[PDB]
Design a binder for this molecule. Structure first.
Ligand SMILES: N[C@@H](CCC(=O)N[C@@H](CS[C@@H]1c2ccccc2-c2ccccc2[C@H]1O)C(=O)NCC(=O)O)C(=O)O
Ligand SMILES: N[C@@H](CCC(=O)N[C@@H](CS[C@@H]1c2ccccc2-c2ccccc2[C@H]1O)C(=O)NCC(=O)O)C(=O)O
Lengths: 210, 209
């Protein structure tokens, strides 16, 4: 059986970037799907350390927290920069991706109809930093840090794909980010994974707003 | 000082990294930013995400408080003994970061209206950390393994600011109560917690706590 198991709701949500990573790296994992019905029963929730999913198992190591799982796969699969400085910059990127992710989630779950217009107007300023980091790394021709893919590329890639669904063309003002998403999306194992039913057939978020 | 910390004259998101630097006997310079300078706009526009803290380690410039904790954890050896412990140190820190956002949100947007409900809900938010301790040698050492990690300093900060918000909130948690007492007593840390640069700084920017 594969050493990896992902336990989560049948949505892309906080597991889309970790699944893209495993698929692009050629690793197998098993999905254990939890329906909203099983979750309301209550017993699996009370068993989760912070009362939430995802849950991930690597052999007998059980982890919670989506970013902990990305960093763990980052360090075991050698996707964490080539030295100490790169690793610090990969973290700095992931943390800026997590802050925009939090704001995204908050909109979808609490203010979609009344805040979409204001969130969209303010998007370009939130996206500029990643355009700027790409500008300074080999003129935006490789990955977000150094010249080897890292876990933060998969998380940043997912964050841009969902915003392009929320605000179509929102990357039009950003040439390096635009080429970056097309370059990454065409990696053979990732392209195949992104066109497969296992990915396309799951909603982005749990309430079906996107 | 290979180190420079740039931030407002408040504890906030720099309390845990200063605790770490002080406890590990490291030297650093504070570059204090007042709300008058901040509002002028120069520095902020040069800030990658438009926010502080900003930290310099020789010619390395970093932003993001958890990035800075991680960097100091990796470089000073406070990231667990191996890959499995590093993953658990991360899991703890992320849990601290989740509760710190809720805390931060109580302070900046719903203090007078949302404080009673927040305090009523707190015991449920502190249980996970009581549980993690109980699983590591019965909660007698640190949050993960037998060595201190960068997540211990962040959890310590988070527990100390809640004792301020809701006095006696750890009375129901023996392992967490003990843990604050034992960590607060490390010599270089105890000195720092009693110094004016720590004691005379407000916790938050709006002066609410
Ligand atoms: N810090 C954690 C956050 C984890 C998290 O937010 N988990 C959500 C689902 S992700 C996400 C979501 C976010 C906010 C609110 C609801 C959900 C949700 C609910 C059902 C199905 C899918 C989702 C996802 O959209 C959850 O477990 N909720 C169930 C519960 O807490 O009782 C991580 O990064 O791993
Ligand atoms: N993910 C980032 C968050 C950084 C952050 O929130 N920085 C705040 C100050 S911390 C914190 C704070 C949190 C929320 C709201 C205000 C503040 C604040 C304002 C002034 C002085 C001090 C603070 C702190 O309380 C900031 O720079 N805000 C000013 C600005 O953007 O213009 C990190 O972890 O480093």
């Amino acid at each position: 059986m594969p050493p990896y198991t992902v336990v989560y709701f049948p949505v892309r949500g906080r597991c889309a970037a970790l699944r893209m990573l495993l698929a692009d790296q050629g690793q197998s994992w098993k999905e254990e799907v939890v329906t909203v019905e099983t979750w309301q029963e209550g017993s699996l929730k009370a068993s989760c350390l912070y009362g939430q999913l995802p849950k991930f198992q690597d052999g007998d190591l059980t982890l919670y927290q989506s970013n902990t799982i990305l960093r763990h796969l980052g360090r075991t699969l050698g996707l964490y920069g080539k030295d100490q400085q790169e690793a610090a910059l990969v973290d700095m990127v992931n943390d800026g991706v997590e802050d925009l992710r939090c704001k995204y989630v908050s909109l979808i779950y609490t203010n979609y109809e009344a805040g979409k217009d204001d969130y969209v107007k303010a998007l370009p300023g939130q996206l500029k930093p990643f355009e700027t980091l790409l500008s300074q790394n080999q003129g935006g021709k490789t990955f977000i840090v150094g010249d080897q893919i890292s876990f933060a590329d998969y998380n940043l890639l997912d964050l841009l794909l969902i915003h392009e669904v929320l605000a179509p063309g929102c990357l039009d003002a950003f040439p390096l980010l635009s080429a970056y998403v097309g370059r990454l999306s065409a990696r053979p194992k990732l392209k195949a994974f992104l066109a497969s039913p296992e990915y396309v057939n799951l909603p982005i978020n749990g309430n079906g707003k996107q």
